[PDB]
């Protein structure tokens, strides 16, 4: 069947064919005068994709962090877990200040001109929600991050209670929330199946209404991701191995297969048996990598910082505004903190792009924001490839360092 042949086709080879045929059609219709037809006919096939991406940002964020923070064992994270969560806190501080520097050296969105701050004691006091249901009903991503982590921790204090009724009740609540999380992981597969038509429509009406300087500046955001990404490999992981004695040249020759696997499959959780194979081939003992790789699958803020350091700068310069370094540090550190614990799930790109509109602060009713937010939702697939690639090699680096220290 034709529908079965269309679904059976792989997704990463489908969004790219959607994107190329979007850009070509939007150029050859944007030049030939037929452009008001695109905004009335093709644009609602992309607006539904933008709404489908924002439909599932909140149940993923709640039901993923509850079932994630209810997996924390306080006796498992004794010595190796502390070294890991100090390592990722060190590497995230390099990734933020390198994704900001590479967004500053490039100018993503300089010539796509289409055409008020709370204090630091207010944001950290607005993290705590006054109403958790009201934090879910509104947008309020970071309050439901906080309430989800608190509810996730407070269940494992009940599941090992001396009682049985509260233990059975806590198990049933955790299983219901885990079922909601798996349902929202199953929905994102159908949304990504719809994604070629949506990316086609979005980039088609963008190239139709603007022209060729969109692809001129869109071959700049991808460049500012990727040359900051390889630089974050060569200036962080290549020196963190050379400090701890392990030669980084043979490290890449070992981890090339896991890097290419994570590049193609576009998901760090799925490429885990390939990733543990390289860890076994590098002489790392079973317990070490068996603990650290499923931890680095979930909590690893390396690619998200490199993406949102340049995506927020592009969505700010494309909208006409202008940002300083101390004014965008407090936005990059907000988006990265909002995407915590939810970067290895299949719904990571949804939250990474929904924390861009909340980074601007303008709704999706104004046509200038909706014409610049689609421009990054076009190339999020090409960015997600390198994002997963730099996540997986960072996982391998943090396993190798801790294994060298323990051995």
Author numbering: 2 to 116, 126 to 417
Can I see the authors' text?
Sodium and aspartate symporter GltPh is an archaeal homolog of human glutamate transporters, which clear the neurotransmitter glutamate from the synaptic cleft following rounds of neurotransmission. Briefly, the transporters are homotrimers with each protomer consisting of a centrally located scaffold or trimerization domain and a peripheral transport domain that harbors the L-aspartate (L-asp) and three sodium (Na+) ions binding sites. The crucial conformational transition from the outward-facing state (OFS), in which L-asp binding site is near the extracellular solution, into the inward-facing state (IFS), from which the substrate is released into the cytoplasm, involves a rigid-body ‘elevator-like’ movement of the transport domain by ca 15 Å across the lipid membrane. Here, we report a series of Cryo-EM structures of GltPh reconstituted into nanodiscs in the IFS and OFS.
We isolated two distinct structural classes of GltPhIFS protomers after symmetry expansion and classification without alignment. Thus, we observed both Na+-bound (GltPhIFS-Na) and apo (GltPhIFS-Apo-open) states. In contrast, it flips out toward TM3 in our GltPhIFS-Apo-open structure and the previous GltPhIFS-Apo-closed crystal structure. The consequent release of Na1 and Na3 leads to a restructuring of the NMD motif and outward rotation of M311, which now packs against the open HP2 of GltPhIFS-Apo-open. The guanidinium group of R397 remains between D390 and D394. In contrast, the helices restructure significantly in the apo conformations, particularly in GltPhIFS-Apo-open. Only in GltPhIFS-Apo-open, I350 replaces L347 because the HP2/TM8a motif, particularly the HP2 N-terminal arm, moves outward. In GltPhIFS-TFB-TBOA and GltPhIFS-Apo-open structures, the transport domain leans away from the scaffold far enough to open a window between the two domains that connects the interior of the bilayer to the solvent-filled crevice on the cytoplasmic side of the transporter. We observe excess densities in the opening, suggesting that lipids enter the space at a position structurally symmetric to LipidOut (LipidWindow).
